Amino acid sequence: RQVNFLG
Amino acid sequence: PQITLWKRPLVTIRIGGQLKEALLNTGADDTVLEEMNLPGKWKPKMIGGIGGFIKVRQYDQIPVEICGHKAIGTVLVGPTPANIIGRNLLTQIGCTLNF
Amino acid sequence: PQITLWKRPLVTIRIGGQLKEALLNTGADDTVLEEMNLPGKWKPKMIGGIGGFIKVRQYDQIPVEICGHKAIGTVLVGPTPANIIGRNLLTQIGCTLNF
């Protein structure tokens, strides 16, 4: 499943 | 409140006696925090994003205070590069996107 | 519109005359689309992913229409699980989080 954090 | 997106939408949350800074993340299905002992049983899970997957522990029915709002639900714990509040708890506090 | 979070906040975008579904992602600094060909110069870029940095192509000043709202800005292209609209373009279309 998708936790699309992105720094 | 209304939170604009010029900056990361970071907030301090509370679980029991513990404060964490966490990102309100509409792109995350789930809530994931690092460095958290939590009470009760947990099961291993793997969650994905840009770059691939990490292994986390899934704890259910955990209280999380978010801007004076009381959420209760699943909290994943593992080596996330950012503490994250996902849709599972954002829905409970009545959070929407508006434009 | 107002988009609630019981389901993934997926919307239709138009970019280069193509329609695509994309996720409105407040947890993303930048906009990252799945592999596709885009206009003109691009800079090789690295973005911090899970487990380390991922290679993307950076395209600047690209028009993107999001639910009929116009933005012109940086679009990254690379191995993402989903087309992601990040804060760089959410701010342009006036998107806020509200609760």
Contact indicator for C27, C73 with CB cutoff of 8 Å: no
Give the nearest partner residue to C26 out of B1, B24, B82, using CB atoms. Answer: B24
Distance CA B89, CA B97 (A): 14
Distance CA B45, CA B52 (A): 14
- Read out DSSP for B5-20? SSS--EEEEEETTEEE
Give the nearest partner residue to C25 out of B3, B6, B27, using CB atoms. Answer: B27
Give the nearest partner residue to B82 out of A1, A2, A7, using CB atoms. Answer: A7
Contact indicator for C27, B11 with CB cutoff of 8 Å: no
The CATH code of the domain that includes B3 is 2.40.70.10
Look up the domain containing B25 and give its range: 1-99
Residues with their C more than 2.5 Å from the N of the next written residue in chain B, i.e. before a break, are none
What residues of chain B have any CB closer than 8 angstroms to a CB in chain C? 1-6, 8-9, 23-29, 48-54, 67, 69, 81-82, 84, 87, 90-91, 93-99
Please report residues of B whose CB lies closer than 8 A to that of C31: none
- CA distance, residue C33 to nearest chain B CA (Å): 11
Q: What is the chain C residue with the closest CA to B99? A: C95
Residues in chain B: 99
Instruction: Number of B to C CB contacts under 8 A, please give it.
Output: 127
Strand partners for B83: none
The number of domains in chain B is: 1
Half-sphere exposure of C2 (CA within 13 A, CB side): 7
Q: Which experiment gave this structure?
A: X-ray
Q: Name the residue among B15, B41, B35, B14 with its Cα closest to residue B78.
A: B35
Whether residue B83 lies within 8 A of chain A, CB to CB, comes out as no
Angle at C79 between CA C74 and CA C85, to 5 degrees: 40
Half-sphere exposure of C61 (CA within 13 A, CB side): 2
For chain A, how are helix, strand and coil distributed in percent, rounded to 5? 0, 45, 55
The position carrying tokens 């793997």 is B46
Q: Name the residue among C4, C78, C12 with its Cα closest to residue B49.
A: C78
Touching partners of B (3+ C-beta pairs < 8 Å)? A, C
Distance CA B64, CA B80 (A): 18
φ, ψ for residue C3 (rounded to 5)? Answer: -115, 120
- CA distance, residue B30 to nearest chain A CA (Å): 6
Strand partners for B59: B75
